[PDB]
PDB file of C-alpha atoms in Angstrom:
ATOM      1  CA  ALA A   1       0.000   0.000   0.000  1.00  0.00           C
ATOM      2  CA  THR A   2       1.186   3.513  -0.703  1.00  0.00           C
ATOM      3  CA  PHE A   3       0.943   6.325   1.817  1.00  0.00           C
ATOM      4  CA  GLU A   4       1.725   9.794   0.530  1.00  0.00           C
ATOM      5  CA  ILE A   5       2.810  11.881   3.491  1.00  0.00           C
ATOM      6  CA  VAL A   6       2.453  15.601   2.826  1.00  0.00           C
ATOM      7  CA  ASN A   7       3.645  18.438   5.042  1.00  0.00           C
ATOM      8  CA  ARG A   8       1.373  21.455   4.551  1.00  0.00           C
ATOM      9  CA  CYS A   9       2.659  23.031   7.791  1.00  0.00           C
ATOM     10  CA  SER A  10       4.675  26.250   7.580  1.00  0.00           C
ATOM     11  CA  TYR A  11       7.366  24.486   9.635  1.00  0.00           C
ATOM     12  CA  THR A  12       9.531  21.435   8.931  1.00  0.00           C
ATOM     13  CA  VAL A  13       8.388  18.108  10.349  1.00  0.00           C
ATOM     14  CA  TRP A  14      10.151  14.762  10.486  1.00  0.00           C
ATOM     15  CA  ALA A  15       7.613  12.151   9.456  1.00  0.00           C
ATOM     16  CA  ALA A  16       7.751   8.754  11.145  1.00  0.00           C
ATOM     17  CA  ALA A  17       6.194   5.387  10.314  1.00  0.00           C
ATOM     18  CA  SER A  18       6.374   2.273  12.478  1.00  0.00           C
ATOM     19  CA  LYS A  19       4.413  -0.744  13.623  1.00  0.00           C
ATOM     20  CA  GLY A  20       6.006  -0.670  17.063  1.00  0.00           C
ATOM     21  CA  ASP A  21       8.592  -3.407  16.626  1.00  0.00           C
ATOM     22  CA  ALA A  22       9.828  -2.346  13.188  1.00  0.00           C
ATOM     23  CA  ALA A  23      10.035   0.556  10.768  1.00  0.00           C
ATOM     24  CA  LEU A  24       7.544   0.889   7.943  1.00  0.00           C
ATOM     25  CA  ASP A  25       9.514   1.692   4.769  1.00  0.00           C
ATOM     26  CA  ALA A  26      12.522   3.814   5.811  1.00  0.00           C
ATOM     27  CA  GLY A  27      10.811   4.623   9.122  1.00  0.00           C
ATOM     28  CA  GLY A  28      11.323   8.380   8.946  1.00  0.00           C
ATOM     29  CA  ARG A  29      12.353  11.348   6.828  1.00  0.00           C
ATOM     30  CA  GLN A  30      12.550  15.115   6.927  1.00  0.00           C
ATOM     31  CA  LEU A  31       9.687  16.983   5.240  1.00  0.00           C
ATOM     32  CA  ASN A  32      10.193  20.691   4.702  1.00  0.00           C
ATOM     33  CA  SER A  33       7.092  22.852   4.313  1.00  0.00           C
ATOM     34  CA  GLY A  34       5.278  21.663   1.195  1.00  0.00           C
ATOM     35  CA  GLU A  35       7.243  18.438   0.688  1.00  0.00           C
ATOM     36  CA  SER A  36       5.679  15.053  -0.032  1.00  0.00           C
ATOM     37  CA  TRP A  37       7.187  11.658   0.795  1.00  0.00           C
ATOM     38  CA  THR A  38       5.579   8.468  -0.481  1.00  0.00           C
ATOM     39  CA  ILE A  39       6.140   5.272   1.450  1.00  0.00           C
ATOM     40  CA  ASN A  40       5.248   1.677   0.850  1.00  0.00           C
ATOM     41  CA  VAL A  41       3.630  -0.297   3.645  1.00  0.00           C
ATOM     42  CA  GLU A  42       3.441  -4.090   3.363  1.00  0.00           C
ATOM     43  CA  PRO A  43      -0.053  -5.548   2.978  1.00  0.00           C
ATOM     44  CA  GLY A  44      -1.336  -7.089   6.211  1.00  0.00           C
ATOM     45  CA  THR A  45       0.440  -4.533   8.402  1.00  0.00           C
ATOM     46  CA  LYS A  46      -1.378  -4.547  11.750  1.00  0.00           C
ATOM     47  CA  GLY A  47      -1.103  -1.679  14.228  1.00  0.00           C
ATOM     48  CA  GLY A  48       0.822   0.675  11.967  1.00  0.00           C
ATOM     49  CA  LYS A  49       1.187   4.353  12.873  1.00  0.00           C
ATOM     50  CA  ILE A  50       2.336   7.503  11.108  1.00  0.00           C
ATOM     51  CA  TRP A  51       3.118  10.708  12.992  1.00  0.00           C
ATOM     52  CA  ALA A  52       4.986  13.993  12.766  1.00  0.00           C
ATOM     53  CA  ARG A  53       7.980  14.935  14.879  1.00  0.00           C
ATOM     54  CA  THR A  54       8.894  18.558  15.548  1.00  0.00           C
ATOM     55  CA  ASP A  55      12.090  20.450  16.392  1.00  0.00           C
ATOM     56  CA  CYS A  56      14.506  17.647  15.536  1.00  0.00           C
ATOM     57  CA  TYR A  57      18.262  17.533  15.282  1.00  0.00           C
ATOM     58  CA  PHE A  58      20.129  14.644  13.697  1.00  0.00           C
ATOM     59  CA  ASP A  59      23.812  14.067  13.100  1.00  0.00           C
ATOM     60  CA  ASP A  60      25.269  12.539   9.929  1.00  0.00           C
ATOM     61  CA  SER A  61      24.517   9.025  11.216  1.00  0.00           C
ATOM     62  CA  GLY A  62      20.823   9.794  11.756  1.00  0.00           C
ATOM     63  CA  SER A  63      21.002   9.989  15.548  1.00  0.00           C
ATOM     64  CA  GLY A  64      19.665  12.901  17.567  1.00  0.00           C
ATOM     65  CA  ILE A  65      16.558  14.178  19.302  1.00  0.00           C
ATOM     66  CA  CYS A  66      13.099  15.618  18.591  1.00  0.00           C
ATOM     67  CA  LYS A  67      10.981  17.683  20.952  1.00  0.00           C
ATOM     68  CA  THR A  68       7.830  15.771  20.058  1.00  0.00           C
ATOM     69  CA  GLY A  69       7.499  12.215  18.789  1.00  0.00           C
ATOM     70  CA  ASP A  70      11.131  11.207  19.253  1.00  0.00           C
ATOM     71  CA  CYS A  71      11.644   7.498  18.562  1.00  0.00           C
ATOM     72  CA  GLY A  72      14.738   6.536  20.552  1.00  0.00           C
ATOM     73  CA  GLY A  73      16.718   9.345  18.925  1.00  0.00           C
ATOM     74  CA  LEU A  74      16.594   7.891  15.412  1.00  0.00           C
ATOM     75  CA  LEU A  75      15.822   9.685  12.167  1.00  0.00           C
ATOM     76  CA  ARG A  76      14.571   6.365  10.810  1.00  0.00           C
ATOM     77  CA  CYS A  77      12.069   5.204  13.425  1.00  0.00           C
ATOM     78  CA  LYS A  78      11.851   1.527  14.327  1.00  0.00           C
ATOM     79  CA  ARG A  79       9.670   2.126  17.393  1.00  0.00           C
ATOM     80  CA  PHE A  80       6.738   4.355  18.357  1.00  0.00           C
ATOM     81  CA  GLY A  81       7.340   7.981  19.301  1.00  0.00           C
ATOM     82  CA  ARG A  82       7.405   9.856  22.584  1.00  0.00           C
ATOM     83  CA  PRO A  83       4.147  11.700  23.333  1.00  0.00           C
ATOM     84  CA  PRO A  84       2.679  14.122  22.549  1.00  0.00           C
ATOM     85  CA  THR A  85       1.975  12.718  19.077  1.00  0.00           C
ATOM     86  CA  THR A  86      -1.157  13.003  16.946  1.00  0.00           C
ATOM     87  CA  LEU A  87      -1.466   9.498  15.476  1.00  0.00           C
ATOM     88  CA  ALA A  88      -2.629   8.219  12.098  1.00  0.00           C
ATOM     89  CA  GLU A  89      -3.365   4.557  12.862  1.00  0.00           C
ATOM     90  CA  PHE A  90      -4.069   1.690  10.493  1.00  0.00           C
ATOM     91  CA  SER A  91      -4.394  -2.049  10.114  1.00  0.00           C
ATOM     92  CA  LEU A  92      -4.392  -3.316   6.541  1.00  0.00           C
ATOM     93  CA  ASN A  93      -5.868  -6.436   4.949  1.00  0.00           C
ATOM     94  CA  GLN A  94      -7.645  -7.585   8.080  1.00  0.00           C
ATOM     95  CA  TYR A  95     -10.076 -10.198   6.788  1.00  0.00           C
ATOM     96  CA  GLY A  96     -10.450  -8.355   3.489  1.00  0.00           C
ATOM     97  CA  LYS A  97     -10.702  -4.787   4.800  1.00  0.00           C
ATOM     98  CA  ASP A  98      -8.491  -1.903   5.942  1.00  0.00           C
ATOM     99  CA  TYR A  99      -9.168   0.039   9.150  1.00  0.00           C
ATOM    100  CA  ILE A 100      -8.041   3.620   9.742  1.00  0.00           C
ATOM    101  CA  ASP A 101      -8.374   6.217  12.490  1.00  0.00           C
ATOM    102  CA  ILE A 102      -6.788   9.245  14.108  1.00  0.00           C
ATOM    103  CA  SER A 103      -6.001   9.096  17.823  1.00  0.00           C
ATOM    104  CA  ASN A 104      -5.255  11.688  20.508  1.00  0.00           C
ATOM    105  CA  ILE A 105      -4.754   8.947  23.147  1.00  0.00           C
ATOM    106  CA  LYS A 106      -1.015   9.753  23.102  1.00  0.00           C
ATOM    107  CA  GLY A 107      -1.635  13.501  22.923  1.00  0.00           C
ATOM    108  CA  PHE A 108      -1.490  15.970  20.062  1.00  0.00           C
ATOM    109  CA  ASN A 109       1.424  17.786  18.433  1.00  0.00           C
ATOM    110  CA  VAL A 110       0.542  18.542  14.795  1.00  0.00           C
ATOM    111  CA  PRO A 111      -2.877  18.707  13.067  1.00  0.00           C
ATOM    112  CA  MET A 112      -3.556  15.943  10.551  1.00  0.00           C
ATOM    113  CA  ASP A 113      -5.855  14.625   7.850  1.00  0.00           C
ATOM    114  CA  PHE A 114      -5.742  10.892   7.064  1.00  0.00           C
ATOM    115  CA  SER A 115      -7.688  10.043   3.905  1.00  0.00           C
ATOM    116  CA  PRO A 116      -7.880   7.307   1.281  1.00  0.00           C
ATOM    117  CA  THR A 117      -6.623   8.198  -2.199  1.00  0.00           C
ATOM    118  CA  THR A 118      -8.667   5.321  -3.602  1.00  0.00           C
ATOM    119  CA  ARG A 119     -12.428   4.657  -3.624  1.00  0.00           C
ATOM    120  CA  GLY A 120     -14.836   3.272  -1.061  1.00  0.00           C
ATOM    121  CA  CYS A 121     -14.506   5.173   2.229  1.00  0.00           C
ATOM    122  CA  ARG A 122     -14.123   8.578   3.855  1.00  0.00           C
ATOM    123  CA  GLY A 123     -11.125  10.186   5.526  1.00  0.00           C
ATOM    124  CA  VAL A 124     -10.722  11.359   9.108  1.00  0.00           C
ATOM    125  CA  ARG A 125      -9.309  14.638  10.382  1.00  0.00           C
ATOM    126  CA  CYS A 126      -8.149  16.351  13.550  1.00  0.00           C
ATOM    127  CA  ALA A 127      -7.119  19.848  12.552  1.00  0.00           C
ATOM    128  CA  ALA A 128      -8.295  22.073  15.408  1.00  0.00           C
ATOM    129  CA  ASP A 129      -5.795  24.191  17.375  1.00  0.00           C
ATOM    130  CA  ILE A 130      -5.396  21.693  20.193  1.00  0.00           C
ATOM    131  CA  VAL A 131      -1.959  23.009  21.176  1.00  0.00           C
ATOM    132  CA  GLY A 132      -3.211  26.597  21.411  1.00  0.00           C
ATOM    133  CA  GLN A 133      -6.280  25.606  23.441  1.00  0.00           C
ATOM    134  CA  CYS A 134      -4.556  22.910  25.546  1.00  0.00           C
ATOM    135  CA  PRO A 135      -5.494  22.848  29.246  1.00  0.00           C
ATOM    136  CA  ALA A 136      -2.671  24.256  31.381  1.00  0.00           C
ATOM    137  CA  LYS A 137      -2.006  20.967  33.166  1.00  0.00           C
ATOM    138  CA  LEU A 138      -1.626  19.102  29.857  1.00  0.00           C
ATOM    139  CA  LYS A 139       0.721  21.547  28.127  1.00  0.00           C
ATOM    140  CA  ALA A 140       4.021  19.869  27.272  1.00  0.00           C
ATOM    141  CA  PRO A 141       6.907  22.249  28.047  1.00  0.00           C
ATOM    142  CA  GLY A 142       8.795  20.552  25.218  1.00  0.00           C
ATOM    143  CA  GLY A 143       5.899  21.376  22.867  1.00  0.00           C
ATOM    144  CA  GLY A 144       2.412  19.951  22.197  1.00  0.00           C
ATOM    145  CA  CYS A 145      -0.560  18.889  24.322  1.00  0.00           C
ATOM    146  CA  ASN A 146      -0.089  15.753  26.435  1.00  0.00           C
ATOM    147  CA  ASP A 147      -2.776  13.174  27.049  1.00  0.00           C
ATOM    148  CA  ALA A 148      -3.794  12.743  30.697  1.00  0.00           C
ATOM    149  CA  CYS A 149      -2.316   9.241  30.989  1.00  0.00           C
ATOM    150  CA  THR A 150       1.130  10.573  30.098  1.00  0.00           C
ATOM    151  CA  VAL A 151       0.804  13.382  32.630  1.00  0.00           C
ATOM    152  CA  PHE A 152      -0.854  11.658  35.599  1.00  0.00           C
ATOM    153  CA  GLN A 153      -0.283   7.886  35.230  1.00  0.00           C
ATOM    154  CA  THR A 154      -3.577   6.746  36.754  1.00  0.00           C
ATOM    155  CA  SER A 155      -5.610   3.647  36.032  1.00  0.00           C
ATOM    156  CA  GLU A 156      -8.504   5.891  35.019  1.00  0.00           C
ATOM    157  CA  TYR A 157      -6.620   7.884  32.374  1.00  0.00           C
ATOM    158  CA  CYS A 158      -4.535   4.960  31.137  1.00  0.00           C
ATOM    159  CA  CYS A 159      -7.516   2.547  31.203  1.00  0.00           C
ATOM    160  CA  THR A 160      -5.236  -0.020  32.750  1.00  0.00           C
ATOM    161  CA  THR A 161      -8.013  -2.323  33.945  1.00  0.00           C
ATOM    162  CA  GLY A 162     -10.097  -1.984  30.784  1.00  0.00           C
ATOM    163  CA  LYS A 163     -12.638  -0.150  32.913  1.00  0.00           C
ATOM    164  CA  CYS A 164     -12.390   3.562  32.415  1.00  0.00           C
ATOM    165  CA  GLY A 165     -14.757   6.378  31.463  1.00  0.00           C
ATOM    166  CA  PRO A 166     -14.418   9.733  29.730  1.00  0.00           C
ATOM    167  CA  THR A 167     -12.729  12.452  31.781  1.00  0.00           C
ATOM    168  CA  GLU A 168     -12.499  16.239  31.803  1.00  0.00           C
ATOM    169  CA  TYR A 169      -9.245  15.856  29.884  1.00  0.00           C
ATOM    170  CA  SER A 170     -10.504  13.347  27.309  1.00  0.00           C
ATOM    171  CA  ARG A 171     -13.556  15.543  26.724  1.00  0.00           C
ATOM    172  CA  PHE A 172     -11.259  18.437  25.773  1.00  0.00           C
ATOM    173  CA  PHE A 173      -9.657  16.411  22.983  1.00  0.00           C
ATOM    174  CA  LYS A 174     -13.078  15.108  21.930  1.00  0.00           C
ATOM    175  CA  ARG A 175     -14.612  18.579  21.833  1.00  0.00           C
ATOM    176  CA  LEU A 176     -11.823  19.942  19.631  1.00  0.00           C
ATOM    177  CA  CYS A 177     -11.661  16.777  17.493  1.00  0.00           C
ATOM    178  CA  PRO A 178     -14.834  14.667  17.519  1.00  0.00           C
ATOM    179  CA  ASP A 179     -13.448  12.372  14.819  1.00  0.00           C
ATOM    180  CA  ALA A 180     -10.384  11.154  16.766  1.00  0.00           C
ATOM    181  CA  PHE A 181     -10.068   8.767  19.712  1.00  0.00           C
ATOM    182  CA  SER A 182      -9.863  10.775  22.953  1.00  0.00           C
ATOM    183  CA  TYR A 183      -9.362   7.905  25.410  1.00  0.00           C
ATOM    184  CA  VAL A 184      -8.903   4.135  25.211  1.00  0.00           C
ATOM    185  CA  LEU A 185     -12.599   3.198  25.426  1.00  0.00           C
ATOM    186  CA  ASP A 186     -13.922   6.092  23.365  1.00  0.00           C
ATOM    187  CA  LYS A 187     -16.783   5.293  21.002  1.00  0.00           C
ATOM    188  CA  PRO A 188     -14.781   4.195  17.945  1.00  0.00           C
ATOM    189  CA  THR A 189     -14.222   6.600  15.054  1.00  0.00           C
ATOM    190  CA  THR A 190     -12.495   3.930  12.983  1.00  0.00           C
ATOM    191  CA  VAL A 191     -13.304   3.939   9.269  1.00  0.00           C
ATOM    192  CA  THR A 192     -13.562   0.700   7.289  1.00  0.00           C
ATOM    193  CA  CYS A 193     -11.935   0.912   3.854  1.00  0.00           C
ATOM    194  CA  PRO A 194     -11.617  -1.642   1.056  1.00  0.00           C
ATOM    195  CA  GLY A 195      -8.685  -3.991   1.612  1.00  0.00           C
ATOM    196  CA  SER A 196      -5.521  -2.703  -0.088  1.00  0.00           C
ATOM    197  CA  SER A 197      -6.613   0.926  -0.252  1.00  0.00           C
ATOM    198  CA  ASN A 198      -3.986   3.655  -0.612  1.00  0.00           C
ATOM    199  CA  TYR A 199      -3.781   6.768   1.547  1.00  0.00           C
ATOM    200  CA  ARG A 200      -2.530  10.287   2.108  1.00  0.00           C
ATOM    201  CA  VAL A 201      -1.553  11.710   5.493  1.00  0.00           C
ATOM    202  CA  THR A 202      -1.475  15.520   5.391  1.00  0.00           C
ATOM    203  CA  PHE A 203       0.027  17.525   8.247  1.00  0.00           C
ATOM    204  CA  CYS A 204      -1.629  20.932   8.783  1.00  0.00           C
ATOM    205  CA  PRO A 205      -4.396  20.229   6.249  1.00  0.00           C
ATOM    206  CA  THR A 206      -6.119  23.576   6.859  1.00  0.00           C
ATOM    207  CA  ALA A 207      -3.027  25.786   7.251  1.00  0.00           C
TER     208      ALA A 207
END
């Protein structure tokens, strides 16, 4: 499957793509404002994620740091990124269908649209100014808006027991972005697409 990753932000981002225990494609790349990077993701990929990283520095070997979404200091991510990270999430070719969503469960750093480029389903978007409107207690000094689990480490926010409800914090993310997961047991906003669809992830789709 192809994913075209497009940076419409006025700032550089370092895109990342991983399934948690391995890179997808090269795993990461710099995208200046306006740049597009197309990656190939193997059919059947389960639990894949794409995200943006901000304010990164890498040496000539591809080792460094990002202020949001850092994946063990690598340019080419093999693992998931450090919150806060707006997440484009997907599982492909699962009994004949693809499943896509956007999640704020690990916080929000950069606005995103995640849409099919092929027929048969709709896209999802979280493009509100979540960083600007972020509750004081969730603001990440390093940049972005943390989820409450990251900040407070409670069973209720982290849904550790599989028994949690919505919270004042989850409701903030849900109010700003109804079409993204705001906590683990949120009413799903997952979209079912034809198996083997192709996609575009656009950072800063509205600005």
